[PDB]
Design a protein around this nucleic acid. Sequence first.
RNA 1: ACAU
DNA 2: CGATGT
Length: 136
Amino acid sequence: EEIIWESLSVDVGSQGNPGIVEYKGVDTKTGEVLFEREPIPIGTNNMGEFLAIVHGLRYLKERNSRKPIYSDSQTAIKWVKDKKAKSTLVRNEETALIWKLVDEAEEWLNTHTYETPILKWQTDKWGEIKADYGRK
RNA sequence: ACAU
DNA sequence: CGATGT
Ligand SMILES: [Cl-]
Ligand SMILES: [Cl-]
Ligand SMILES: [Cl-]
Ligand SMILES: [Li+]
Ligand SMILES: [Mg+2]
Ligand SMILES: [Mg+2]
């Protein structure tokens, strides 16, 4: 398995889980940050991974790009394939923002088409995904 | 068990 | 050590 360098890599980072969630997408080859979401006060790791992939799909579609997306999240790759994010996070006023984003991301997937391959980054062979946040 |  | 997920 060769890395597909002509691709977009996404990943989540957080302070607490559940906690403050952010995510970003980078050029897999150069590491250039192509988008980064403003921190969301309360969410889960998997919600952030999910939003990161969907944002990537929207980013590539808008730019007429056929590049694949790498994610390291087994969970979020499945959620995108299903068009359904099966998060356990409670719905309350503190989690309303992220739940609105998740609901809207599902809605986008149910109203648009894409051919973008969503690929599992093979961390065991390649090391950390290039969008990883690391340690604070 | 696997993945974050 | 615990949390989010299949
Ligand atoms: Cl978002
Ligand atoms: Cl997977
Ligand atoms: Cl591909
Ligand atoms: Li990740
Ligand atoms: Mg990471
Ligand atoms: Mg980390």
